[model samples]
Structures are given as structure tokens and as C-alpha cells.
Target: NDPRLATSPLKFPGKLAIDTLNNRLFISDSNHNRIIVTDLEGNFIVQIGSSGEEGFQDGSFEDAAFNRPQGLAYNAKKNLLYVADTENHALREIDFVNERVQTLAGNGTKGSDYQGGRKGTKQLLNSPWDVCFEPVNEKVYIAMAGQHQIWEYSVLDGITRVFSGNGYERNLNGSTPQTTSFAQPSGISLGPDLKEAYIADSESSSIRALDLQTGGSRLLAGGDPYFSENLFKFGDNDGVGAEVLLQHPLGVLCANDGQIYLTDSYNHKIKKLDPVTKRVVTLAGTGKAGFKDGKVKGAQLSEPAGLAITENGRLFVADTNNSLIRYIDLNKGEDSEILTLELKGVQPPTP
Candidate 1:
């Protein structure tokens, strides 16, 4: 795995946008107050967005509108870029064609603002962590962690469904209206074929999967009050196999090849989980908490946050702590190249 792909200075390179078709990489450049675009090798191409709070056109971003952009996605069909203006708690659709940015939902404020019932215009989001488009159904799923739920909306601007409910309760089995659960259901994405939806139920210390067809969900890993190791074969807190799972999984994405990628945030590692065999394995990052590289490398994450995969199957990880973006080989093996990124842009000086 290549850990240092390109070494250009970027301010807390938070989230990444990978366009496999053109081999372009977009860095959220979070704290730096801009978005930096680069090639696969992290060569600088251009930068967009700025620090400001103004309306669509004619707004000077020099005041710093992007408080902390934590999520990003590219809609190839529309040639648009979707960014979860995370800390701002808003979603903005960037029309790259016109270089125009507009708010998709939510104000730059906090509160459980429900957008009626339609997905695109009606489904309200609160502190959304990530947003993605469903190619099969042409739908959009918002990982609304603030509401402790995953929401589905029509890509055509029609219907919206609550794939998962509010965070107050844990519905380990399915939809049952059980309150006081789902501490923080962060990342949400469908499987390779969109047969299932995977959630990085962060605070719960487990990854949950739901059958898209049946709306049935089961805890794939982690222990809970209802089911413990004694109740299942996995055993308690084993730290290996399905039983030994994640700590605070921040992000979840499915590869085109059917492999599941999870950002075990607090654990400082990217874990690959197989749905068929129920196996969880680490892909990169040192097991500890410092900023290092390699298998068993020391403390490889400050706080590994978001994850995304290109159509070409390249895995991009937001290595928060080291202020870098990292990637791994799509083909699974011991020799996967883990590389860090260096992009063009003025960045914060390393102390």
C-alpha cells in the first residue's frame, strides 16, 4: 500500500473526491478554506470554494463560508460535485460546469429541520456526514448522523424514505420503533449490487447492515445488551474475526468488487469486512494512535474520518490526524501500496 502518493502541503486534508474516469482527485482542504483538485499522483490542477458565508452567485467566499467540509461526492451524470458542508450542517451542490455553488438542504444552523416528505427537496438533513448517489435506483442516500438515521431520496426529486430511523433507539433487527438507540449512525452506503445498506453506527461500536429489499437489519459486529458473545458464537471482545470488530467506525463504503471498506476511526485503521463470511480485517494504518505508516505501524491516525472509492476501485481514506489523504490497492493482498498525498495549495505549516 502506498501511504505517500504526493506530498504537497494541504490544510487538514479532510475529505477526498476521486473521479476514476479522468483519474482526478479532489481534496476537501477543510481547514484551509478551499477545495483542491489534482491528478492521481497529487499534482495540483486547480482549487475551488473559499471561506465565506454568502448566497450562490456574487458571494465572496473570502470570509470563509466552509467551516469544515467533511464530505464530498461527484455526480458524473450531471457533472456536479456534492459536498456535505459538515460543520455548517448544510449540503451544497457544486455545478462544476458553471462554477456555481448552491445550498441543497439545511441552513448553516442546527436543529432537526425535517424537509416535508420528498427526498431531494423535502427530506431535511441535520449535521449530515456523507452524501452519495445510488446508480442502480438513481436515488440519493444521506448519512445524517445528527439525526441518527439514514435517509433515502429520489435522484429525480420525488420521494424520500427513512432507511433508518432517528438516533434515539437501536433497531438491531429492523424497524421496530425502539427509542434510545443508534448513538451516531454516521456513514451510509449500499452494497456492490445495492442489495444491502451498510451503516457505520459509530457510537455503537459496530457496523450494521440492512437488507434493502426487506428493510431487515442485523448487527454484523460488536456486542450489545440484547446479544452478547455468550448469545452468539463470535465471543466477547475477541479483537479478531467477526467478534473482534470496530471501535468508532466513522465511514462505510462498498467497492465495485463486493468488498466492504470501513474507517475504524478511533482504532486508527481501515477495516475490510466480508459480508458472506462475516470476517473483519484491517487494511492499513498503524494499530495505535500516533501518525505513522505500515502494518502495525505506530498510531497511524489522528482521527480517520471519511472514506470513498473510485469507479476504478481505488480506496481513498481521509487520514484526519496526519492531515493527509491515503489510498490502498484494490486487489487484496499483503503488498497493497499505501500512499499519502501532497497537493498544490497554500497549507498550514507543520509545527
Candidate 2:
């Protein structure tokens, strides 16, 4: 029997990341104050983080378990999990071997600021929104949403290297700005070859690409489709205009085949954008925010937030409001799978 899901059991499950190495799914269950873990089938497993002061087993977290945990990335080479503990204003590390949680850096606050002029071998951060690693050089890049920029950290010493994007004011030449700029650069992903970094500059209504080795950035697409109107607004009945074009891209994934997929959170849809052809298209979800399948054309999503594509081309979406896990095989469209919390045998009952 297909189990029905609870009405919004997960509190804003924001960043949906897949651990290809272990075949596990990691979701930043923001409102529930924990990182929900499960198998690829969406079965509940274990959770990390609790509402309390930071420490072990006390089940408490040092900084608001997760006021808004947004982005997450796993470094297979290091067997480590990096989480962008958003509102807490920090980057957190999960030890894979022991499954322990530790703070990598940050003061646990919010704002738009900058961590500038740091030389070599130093550990620090300011409201990091996402974490990505460059395997070629073993360097980790942190998207500092609060600081309105991106920073580079040495994998060996956690030292700071470069910082770019000081504000929302776009510098056409890719030069690092002096003031905090980006409106809200929430999601980030590396290209298939790791030569470039794609940033979903949400508030800017654009996706920006930065050279991994150099601090050069250029706007990719958006304006040509929607004009200069803000697409994000909670519960607005604008009725599917071009303004509906990615109101808030919260997650991004580059599949093994070099396809770039983005979770346009507030828009209630997932889009597959071709970098080479500049062809943008919607791959899943009816531009609607809801728990139902193909219910309202494209307005059924209450908040389809996190997105991921498995190695075999299977698409997974965290339907936030419905508190359900939805899956669709690209090869077999329309025939989708939905996993809900009520699925009793889904994984030994939630403790």
C-alpha cells in the first residue's frame, strides 16, 4: 500500500545533498533542528543536531540547531560532510567515521559582511551559505551569503585564500568589490569537470559562473526570459508570469553527464539548464508548490526545495510542504514515486 505523508512533517527541509559514495541522502531539516538522514529510497534513518547548547550526546546544538540550514556538500575523497548552517552563521563539519558534529568556523550570527585580507594558514568564516571542494587542488570554496562573497580555504590547514563578491552590485569585470554585495547567493555547485563554479544568486534573479582558479564571474541566464522583475514572494498569486522564473534557486547539481540541474525553490519546480546550448527547460514539478503530482500545471508546489540526481539519472526532490520525498526517472516521465513519513516500514519507525 502507498502510505500518505504527514502534512509538512519536515520544517523547511532546505539543502538536499546526496552522498554518492555511500548511497545516502542528507537533508537539512531546518525547522526540526536536525539533519535528517536516510537511504536513497527516502527511508528514515538517523538524525543529527538537537535544540540545545553545543556539545556531544546532550543532543544540543551550539547555534540554533538550524535556524535555516541551507546548503550541504560531501567530499567523497575526505569522507566528510560540510553543512551550511545558514542562520546560525557558520559552516559545520560532520565526521563520517564517527558521525560526530563539529564547528569548522563562524561566530553564529547573521548579516552581510566580509572576511577580508587574510594571508595563508588561518581558520575563519562569516555566515557561510554553501561549501564546495576542488579535488584537483584539494581546496574548499565557501559561499559566504552573509558576507556577500565567496572564500577559498586550504583543505590541509583551513587557511583563507581568496574572497570575492562583496555586495549585490555586480562588477561586470569580475573584480572583487569593496562592500558586501550579493543580495543572497544561496546555492552553489561545481561543474562536471570542476573547472568552473555555478552560483545561484537568488535575489539577483541570475546564475553566476566563476572560474575556479581565478575570481572571474559572469551572469549566465534569466533576464532574457523574465525581464527585470522580482520572482520571489511568499504566497503571491501572480499566476505564472516570466517573473515565475526561478524565484529562489536553493540547490544545484551537476550530473555525471555534464547536465546542470537547479532547484528553483519558491517557484515550485526543478529546471535543467544546458550550459553549452544556453537552452533552459523545466524537467520536473508543475510550476506549482504542492504535494500532489501534476495537479496544478506548475503551481502545485508549496515549496519544492532540495533537488538531486542520482548516478543512474533518477531525480529526487524534497517536497517541503507535503513532507514527502518524490522521485522520477528521467527515462520514464509521469511514472513517479512518492515516499511519505507514514510509510511504516520505511525504516524501523522514527525514534
Candidate 3:
């Protein structure tokens, strides 16, 4: 094949976790198969995993290895970091205090089980895309995308279980999780109250909410089966409920104000959704896959995947395809800016 005709592969950052207490930012540098730590201003702090390394070894920070890790969750209270070691089909834990890496779940193979009481590597996992913590309860919620379910891993008990979803892939919703379903739930965020967990169900192009207390599932937007079977409905319409359209939204966030933010990845846009009103509106991006940083209305993004927000109203975006981190201070209104997170002292992996 001609060089120009050959398909090119791209490396992308997977997700971000902001540590408000320590003013730290955690990034899942997916394609590099590592986790990167930086200050809130994008100043390099420390990098876990050898440069460009891809394996399943756990050791000191510099010696640890990961296989295409995605999703980062920081527990500021305990100074711990969680990784969805996606391609490896496992969950890894980072102890800041000890500067050590350890396996929390998965056996380094494709997993089929939904029930989990096993400890650490004894349990099997599959494509856990994202994770969130319920600190008060000592639990980590995994968006178990490979199995189309959400899993709850209790640190105190050292046990795991299907927190929600039946593993039957679809966009179906129900009062109870066992009867509900999900289609490639790629990202997860918990509400400030910790009562609800929001999911970016990618394949379904929908946002899902789960009542943490009851394990109830509810569709907040997209997934119109009437428009298409298999629940693969998608488009660029900004509307309400089932009428709303998103193209493979991969990341979602539930703000304390109850506003939801979604990265409409394939659509190349970041959107805001009102969970109560069920209204969706474009926050940034021109609905075109390219790069242009400007006012929110004129901004362009390429397959943005993850989102992080600060209490001061700044929204951080994982501009996946562009290999950039973009953020906008929403408090200044939508017209504020779409600025790239300038990384200082951060270098690309060693080839």
C-alpha cells in the first residue's frame, strides 16, 4: 500500500483525575501504557511505568508496567490512585505513600465472570474502562464495559461484585439494575452527594444514571431504539431525553450543581446536559474532527474522551485524537475560552 494510503495509528490520553486536596492531576496516558502525574497547572510531578513500556509487572514507580491503561481515579483521602488497565483486562492500584504498584483485580486475560468475591489477581476482569470512588464506603465503581456492567469493588472487604447491569448489552433502563442494560459504558462519574453514578454509555450514545443506594438504572439521554434497533442511535441533535443525539460519547461527569457534561467523541464536541430537564446543549467544539482552540463556539476538537472539573468551574477535557488536554472555565460563561492545558516538563515516551 502507498504510504499515504496506509492507515495510521494514533495514541491518546484516556482520562484525568484531579486531586483538589494536593493540587494534583492524574492522567491515564493510554497509548503509552502508563500513568502520568502533574500539578494542577500541568507541571510534571511523577510518571509511573517505564517510558513507553507495556507489560503486567508491578514494582517501584519507575519499574511498574501497564498495558494500555485507561481511566484514572484518585482517592485524595488515602493518597491512592486506581487504574483501569484496559488492554490487560485488569485493575491496578497505585500507592502514593509507598510508591508501589499492585494488582487489585483481574488475571491478565479476557474475563467472562460477573460475580466477584475473589481477592486481587484471583479475580478476572474485562475492559474496565473507567472508575470512580465512594470514599465514605471504601468502594471503587468500575465501568466494566467489556461485560456491559458496572462493578463494585469493596476495598475493606476485598471483594467485588456486579454493582449494576445484567451484562445483556443494550440501552434498556429499569428500576432495578438486574433488568437494566448498558452498551459499552466507557466512563463514569459520581454525583457530589454520592447517591448517583453517571455513565457515558458509548456504543449506545447515551448517558445513564444509577441510584447508588438502590442500584436502579435510568437513561438520562440518547438511546432511541425507535430510531434504530440494537440501540446504536446517534447523531448531532441537541435536545432532550430520547430525542437527544450523541455520537459515541465516551466520557461523562456529574457536576455538583447536577449539571452533566458529556464528551460526544465521534461528534467532536463537548456538551452539557441537564439531568433534571433532560436538555442537551453544545458547550464547545464545531462538530468537526480537527483542532482549533478559540472561543467555545468556534473551538474544534477531535474525539475528546474524558472530562474533569474543578470547584472554581473549570472544565478539563481529554482531547483524545488531538493528543491534547483542553479546559474551559465554565464560570466565566460559555464564551470564556477553550485553552489547552500547557504541560511543563512532560516529555513523550522514549521510543
Candidate 4:
């Protein structure tokens, strides 16, 4: 049965993952303390945990537990689903074939210690916010937001380590990963070639790129590592590099078409970044937070948190505060509208 219909509200959904091969959607129901699985059309399939049942147990899907789970990555090759169990300070893996769940990383303790050796269960993670798999190295990169760094986990070797960012919060870019710094990096997306990964550094309101070849890191968009206090400080400015200002962006998607999309969370807008031109432009949503669906430029979104791009150029967004999933057809021209998905036989509880 669909639990959300009878239980509490869907509070602060954090991240989303789409299994194109299986036609399934996985959402990190952050405040609900579980992961919800649904079909592409929003039909409730099942969930990983019961409402408010947060723990570290690994058993059947319903018996498994997670605390404020956020961010998801699907590895089709292995038929596995990886999750960033934020509040639990751990990374979890779901074996689709066997329908089993296990803690892959983190020792169930929270800290900035870099003790990564034995596989993942022994490793300690600090508030890992997002995860992405790079096909080139077959390693999973984690956005360790609480530690202000990125961590790497190799399935082949079963080893996990800090991949990028120093253990501090700064916007400094450098030729080496260890020298660079990030401010609460929240979202990560691997490029099509898998040679690079793009990050949505949330607290800094900037975009960062990491080179897999040389362990180099660079600022791709936005500027300065500081939070914006002025609500009127951000807008639809289409400009090059730091000329644009974003308000606490959280999700990033690097599409196969060589275009990058960002869930500009605080700004309540979706912005696009062009790698070749080094420019940023607003793709959807007005500069306001609400629940309105219409033309892209006039639409309203509430703290959109994560993004997923389909092979056919469709963009799915986790409209966090709104508790809704929105989609945009990029191939439908610039004037395309933002559409809110209606979950069949599921409705929010009445106030």
C-alpha cells in the first residue's frame, strides 16, 4: 500500500534517481526517513522503509532502515542501487537481484576523519549528501557535505577515500584535488565521458569540476564561497563564468548533449550552464518559491533539490519543499512548460 497517503506528509525530499532500464524512480524522502520507489508515471511500487522508522538494520526492503536518506545512484551493470543515508552517516547499497540492503560505507559515526581502508562498512563518513558512479574507473564519488569534501569508493577494490576538497569550507580552486576546497557540496554528476565530474557546491552557490585524469579541480561557474543574505541578490542573468550569481544551488545534471543543468534551490529556478561558452542562463522557474506550473520562464518551484536527465532529453527535478516531481522536455523548444506529475491513487494528507 502507498503509506504516504495515510501517514505524515512528504517533508523535504532531497534527491532523485531514475532507472531508465527499469522505468523506475527512486526518491530520497528525507524527512520521511525512507526511500520511495515508483514507476515513471508516479504509481507507488514500494518503499525501502516504513514512515519514521529510522535505523541501521539491513533486511527485507520494508525491514531495512535509513535515517534521512538523500541522494541515489543506480548501477545498471551491477544491478545495484546506492544511497546516501545522510543522518546515519553511512552509504548503503541495494542489490536489486537479491532484494537485499547493506551498509557499504560509514561506521555509523559522524566526523571528518579520513579513515578509509577496508571496503566501506569500516569507513567513516560525515553527512554524505549525494553519490554518482563514474563508468571510467567504476568508482562511486560521494559528496561529503558535512565534511566539505568529496569521497571516492571503488567497487572493484572495495576501498573508500577522500577524492577531492580539503577538510575545510572554501571556494579555492587548484591543480590538485587535495588543495581545492568546497562549501557543503551537495550534488554531483559525472560527465558522459566519465573523465570529469561536476559538483553543485550548495553553500558556495557555485559549480565545480573535477578532473579524473589528473585529480585537478576548477571553478566552472558562479563565484566566491559565501551564502547570499539578500533575497533580491540572484536572478536570470545569462552571462559568462562568475558574472552570474546563484542562490544556494543543490542539484546538478550534466546531460549527454554537453549542457549542464542546476537546481538553483534558493533562487527557485533551474539554470543551464554551457561548457563551451562558459555561460549560465535560467532555463525554468521564476525567481520565486511556490507551486505553479506553466511556461518554463514563468513557472514557480520550491527549493528544487536534485535533477535527473533521461536519454531522450527529459529533465526530472525533485521539487523538495513542494513535495512534487517536475519534468521538462528539453527537446520541446525554449518555451516548453514545466509539468507536475500526478501520483495515481496517492494524495497528500489533509491538514
Candidate 5:
């Protein structure tokens, strides 16, 4: 039988990374098990992975393999790209200059609980939905989905451990670092001031902020799901903090404007939140799912998974289910035009 996955070049792309200085775009073609590198205009530069083979391997760019890689975190200072190789239960590193791939942790063994810290590949990982590279301390914070906690990988020490949350599955922020809990955090964006980590706690349908130093937590939006129906209870209500309702958001970005831009995934919209005022409002999407692109209000996004914004107010989005990459020029409101990347000379891994 013909495979539906092969019907589209990009199958369920899950994340986007923008090199604002260079005007480059990196798309984690998740379901396709590869990462697509391109310019800001959607022109392909390179494709990483042994295209659709779907397994675990490490070597040069041509020999390396990734199985359903999702979240992508790029370190400009180090010139490295870190991938949350989801199905493989691993974390990967790509060296731009060397054009090689290496495993930082998780050797394809999906682990249950992390007892303590482990060095490099010595530690197993849960489903790492997303990764955020903190330049100051040289650490990559993982949204460890399966374990419902935030984990950390140290670049200098080469050690990995639970950074926050006590492995509980709810929207509870404790008084201390170890007591804080997260509900399958799928996205994270470091606050503009570098004092906080803003998380899209997907399962709870809330946006949370964590102190980078002490691990203190605060709810920026959405309410607690203490009741049974509240687990499935979600809607589109835009207002201040806990009063706002979101339908399983999967991505978060601290835009250059000092505002929060997120993918309200299940609700099929891109929303903006003011951390200071704690106000939430819909920026784009019709709440309907489709490819109706043009005016912001008339646009429809189907389960968007990740987003990144440049200093110039260009917002890039990973429109997952639609198999497309789209952008919104926040300055002039010029949205759409570019859909599928041409991918002209960028070849998939040769068999």
C-alpha cells in the first residue's frame, strides 16, 4: 500500500528555530524523522538525518539517523543544534561546521523515572517534547513529557538530572524547587530578562513561569484542573491570568516585544499573552482548522506545535497537521504567501 507519510515532503513538522542574525530557519520535520534547514524565505539549505529510515545511529550528516525527532534548540554561541529525538527517547546534537551528529543522552531506552543524575549517554530519558538552551549557564532544559517534569543537561559537566517538578502530573506550583509540579510541559521559552522560564504546561492547559535560579513557579494563565471534567474542560476565553481558558497549548515563545506568543494547539489558534498585565488575547487563527491563509482573523492553523519570533517582529510557526511552515510579520501584518518549501537541491539521505 502507498504510504500517506510520503504524500508530503514534510510530515508533521513539530518545531521551528530562527537564526535572527542570519535570517535562517530550522524546521524539525518530526514525523519524517529529519530536520529541514532553510533561509527565512523558505529556501532549503540542508536536510539532516537518514531521511525516513527511522532508527538510531550517529556519524556524519549522511550517516546519522533520527526517529521522530520533535523539539529543536539551537545554540548560536556553540554553533550547535540540539534535537529532542522523541520516539527514540534520546537527545541529539548537531555540529554545524563538522556536519556530524552525536547523541548526548538516551540510548533509545524509554525510561520510567530518573532516580538521580547521570553523565551524558549514561542516563535514559523520557519523552522530551521540547528543549530550551540557556546561554548563561550552558544548560539545556528539557520538557520531559513522559515523566511530567523538567530535566536538565549540562554542557560543561556533561551531566543530566531533574531540574524542577517532583514527577507529579498536575498544575501545582509548590513553595520550593523540588515541590513544583508540571503537567506534561510541551514547550518552553526563556523570559526576556533571563530571570524566568515560561512553560506551556499542555495537559493542564496553562502557561507557567519558573524562576531560573530558585525554581519558583507562577501561573500566568489558565486555571487548575482539580475536577474530573476540568481535565477535558477547555475553551477560548481571553482575559487576565487564571481566568483565561486554553485548549491544550503545545508551544510558547517569549517574543522580542516582551510578550508571550503561543500555539493554542487543540483550539487551532496562535495567541498572545502579556506577562505583566497577565492578559491573554487571540492574535491569529479562526478557531477553525484549515489552510485559509491571508488576513489574520481569516487564517486557520491546525494543531500548530512550535513558534519563534525575530527581533524585527517576524513570527515563524510550525503548522504541524497541515505539513507547512508559515509566518506573520507582526509589523505590517503580512501573513501567508510562503507555504511548502521548494526544497530544490536539498536531497534526503541517500539510501
Candidate 6:
């Protein structure tokens, strides 16, 4: 029998993006302060920054430094990788063609503002926790966690502005973008239909959806909005709308199956939401946090914070606290064993 213990070539990995065209996976190795690239089989291909180094340089991958980099988005058409250099308070772009890295947004300082000008680096950005690339309009959306808002970066015009939220940390839903509020929005993913954006509103413990066409937002699930002393107050209650609860969800993925998968972070489970029926279900993991692999329902995940579903119906999870990457094959049913890579010589870092 195989033990459930799995290893990873990352330290506190946060968000990840899959390059479907190139078959590469880009992971934000947050605690290590770098980005790691690998194949679908978890073979290390390259790294975009150095470990224990944090700076704002635009050169080779080895010279470019990031501080607690959290989110990533890959533009297949441009062959560019966008990085939310969280602590550096900047949006960075990597040119795969010429192997060059440069600051695409932010002024290398942490502050929130609307700056639309010739130079993207001159604009100020807060802690950008996650990013999503919309191919329809060729725009990038950022989950500005520190600013409690969502921001948009125009690839064509090099302009950055608040796309949603009113810079307040609350769970208010509205038909207009400027009147809406988000609580520590962390993870963002564009749906397969390309007409909506799914967000993991962390602080409010909710999953939200934004209408790209209407510039309106609505609470999809959770968002109790009120606090409870019991951390486990949120769990696998399968229901509809706000009747379901999620605990500090951080990563969200709109799967090809037309279901939304979320890393219910504090709950230690992967939850699924159906947009049409507004139904919520626990897709994987037991509520208890630990390291175990087996049936999806019986499996134990340690504070899973990132989720990515591929075109082939495979779901990759960043089991954060365990410092491991685990995946489930949706085509194989819920009882399929969770597969992971066995790393050579790395251990989970101290929080």
C-alpha cells in the first residue's frame, strides 16, 4: 500500500496557471519568493526567480526577484507570463520569446490608485493576490487583496484601473461596479464561456461571480459576512446560494464541465458550485486538515489554496500547508486516488 505522504518542489505555493498550448505549469512558490515551472508530470523545467531573494529587477529569470509572489496568468497568444509580485507591489510580465522580464504595472510601492498613462510601471498597486487573463478583450484582471478591489490592466493600452469594488472590505452586491464591495478578493478565474469571472472572496468566506458584460457582481456562495468564533463553522453543506458556507476560500477554477471548483482554504476541502442550479457540493477532501490520499471524499488536504482544472478534466490542487501538489482525475470518478509527485530533497517550511 502506498502511504499518503507526498513531496513538492515548492515552498508554500499559492496560485498557478497552466499553459495548455505549451503543456507547462507555472506555480507561484510564495514562501520561496519565486516562480517554478514544470511539466504536467511535475518535472522541474525552470524557475523564474531566486530563493530568499526579493528585489525589483527586470532581466533574466535568475536576476528578477519577487517578494511573496502569489498569482500567475499566461497569455497563450502573446506567449507572455504575468506575475502578481505581491510584496513588491507590481505587475510583471515575462516574454517567453526573447527571455526577458519587465515590470508591466505598479510603481514599486504599495498603494492603491487609478493611473492611466504611457508607462504602466508609474502606476501604484496594492497587494495583488491573483490575476486572470481574458482572451476576449485581451485584458488582465487582478484581485487586489490589499486594496479590497479588483483592478484591470489593459494589455493594448498599458492602463490600469479599478475594475470592480469600491475600495471597501465588505460583502455588498450591486449591479454597478463602483458601488460593489469585496472582502480580500484572492483568487480569480474566467469561465469557459468567457462571459463571466469567478472570484474567491477570501475574507468574506465566499465565492462570487462578476458579469463581464454588465460590470455587475453577485455572491455565488458562502459570504456569511458575519464573524463566528468557531473556525469550523463553514463546511460541506451541500445546498443552494448563501445557504452553503465556505471557510476562507482562496483559489477558484471554472472547469470545463461547467462547474466552479474552489479551494475552501480553512475548511480543507474542494467545493464545487453549479452556476445554473446554484447548487453547492463538496467535491473532495474531508473537513479535517492533514496529509492523506485516497477517495476524494476520504482524502485529507492541508489548507489547499490553489486549484487548476485542465482541459482533460484533471484538477490540480496546491495543498498549501503540506507543501505538495495533488491532483484528481474527474474522468476517473470521485473515488480515484489522488496522485502527487515525490520530491527529492525538500521539506515544508515553517510558517
Top of the candidates by lDDT: 3
Question: Which one is best on TM-score?
Answer: 3
Give the candidates in order of lDDT, highest first: 3, 5, 4, 6, 1, 2
lDDT accuracy of residue 49 in candidate 2: 65
Residues 1-351 of candidate 2: C-alpha lDDT, one tens digit per residue:
123553434655666778877888877776665676778876666666645223223112323254466677787877777777776766677766766676665556554335543433134455667777777787767777665577776667655634566444332325344332454676777888887887776666555677665566655655323232343332222222223345667666677676777766777776777777655566665665556654223324556666776888777776666666666666544554333323212321133
Better of 1 and 6 by TM-score: 6
The Cα error of candidate 1 at residue 137, in Å, is 3.0
lDDT tens digits, residues 195-269, model 1?
A: 777877776777777666655566776646364222222222324334665677778887777777887887777
Better of 2 and 3 by lDDT: 3
lDDT of each: 0.64, 0.60, 0.85, 0.81, 0.81, 0.80
Q: Model 3 segments beyond 4 Å from truth?
A: 1-10, 225-229
Which residues of candidate 6, in runs, are more than 4 Å off?
Answer: 1-7, 114-118, 225-236, 343-351
Compose the digit string of candidate 3's lDDT tens values, residues 1-351: 223112222258878888888888888889988888888798899989756778998889988899988888888788999899998888889999999998888878988897766887888888999999888998999999999999988989777778888888788777777877888999999987889999999988899898898787787888874432366677899988878999899999888898999999999999999988999999998988887877988888889999888888888998888877789989667467898877887776766
Which residue pairs collide, candidate 5?
none
Sequence-dependent TM-score of model 5:
0.92
The digit string of per-residue lDDT tens for model 4 on 1-351 reads 233322424677899998899888887888777777788887887777763566888877867888888899989888888999998999899878888888888877796675456576777889999999876578899999998888899988888888877766777677777777778899999887788899898877788888877666777777653433222334446689868788788999888877899998988999889987879988888888887887887788989999987788788898898877888888566569998776664433222
Candidate 5 global CA lDDT score: 0.81
What are the RMSD figures for all models against the true structure? 4.8, 5.1, 3.6, 3.9, 3.1, 3.5
Per-residue lDDT of 182 in model 2? 51
lDDT for model 2, on a 0 to 1 scale? Answer: 0.60
